[PDB]
Design a protein around this ligand. Sequence first.
Ligand SMILES: Nc1ncnc2c1ncn2[C@@H]1O[C@H](CO)[C@@H](O)[C@H]1O
Length: 259
Amino acid sequence: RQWALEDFEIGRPLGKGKFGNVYLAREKQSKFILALKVLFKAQLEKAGVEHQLRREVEIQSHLRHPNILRLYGYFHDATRVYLILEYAPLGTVYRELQKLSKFDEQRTATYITELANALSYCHSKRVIRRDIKPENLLLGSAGELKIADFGWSVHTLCGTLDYLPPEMIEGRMHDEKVDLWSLGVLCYEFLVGKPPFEANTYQETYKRISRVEFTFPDFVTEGARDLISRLLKHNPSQRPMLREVLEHPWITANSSKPS
Ligand SMILES: Nc1ncnc2c1ncn2[C@@H]1O[C@H](CO)[C@@H](O)[C@H]1O
């Protein structure tokens, strides 16, 4: 678990993020291909996140699951922090979504099965997440989904409200039901092409989430309207358990993967 820059040969950029860039890289001795995310201490210290990145890395280190992106190790130099990550050859769900505009019921249903499996595993470890969004979902060589970002994951303003539940923007206490809400937001975006509460303004998006105001375009089928309606409920108590999602007749009929 002892690493340094001189162990890796660095390639093309895979993406340019908020605090630094992600590069394709190869470990010199074994020729293992992987991804290396380089982060500035400057942008981090000056934001008060340096404690979070610490714990998020600890958490993700100990996870093993085919639908969660792996974290091999980490280290730091004079001014920067480097994360050694699993490389996903087929890119982000985000890029795939703006290439195709929309996903069919078969691809949507399969992605959600994969997500539910990874969330059941995480909950058995008492791990949750604040939001899950398409630019944080990656695809492996067989085109299978992989979860890459925890956010605040347990073991003014900066952010978009689009993926947060009502109980988190209104201040209230939350439990793992936050993830079930995220399933619903994603199922909608996969089928429609944009998230259900989208708006021109932060303040307005706030109202729409708080009131749970969304409508369906004509092409969304009744099987899909039902699952989504059940997932987006203001009261967290009324949202279904993960195994129920995996047993929904709409999932069952359209998914390629077992639960
Ligand atoms: N392992 C990876 N494979 C491919 N793209 C990645 C990987 N890790 C991060 N990225 C890209 O870099 C961005 C910053 O995390 C992501 O949103 C994604 O686009």
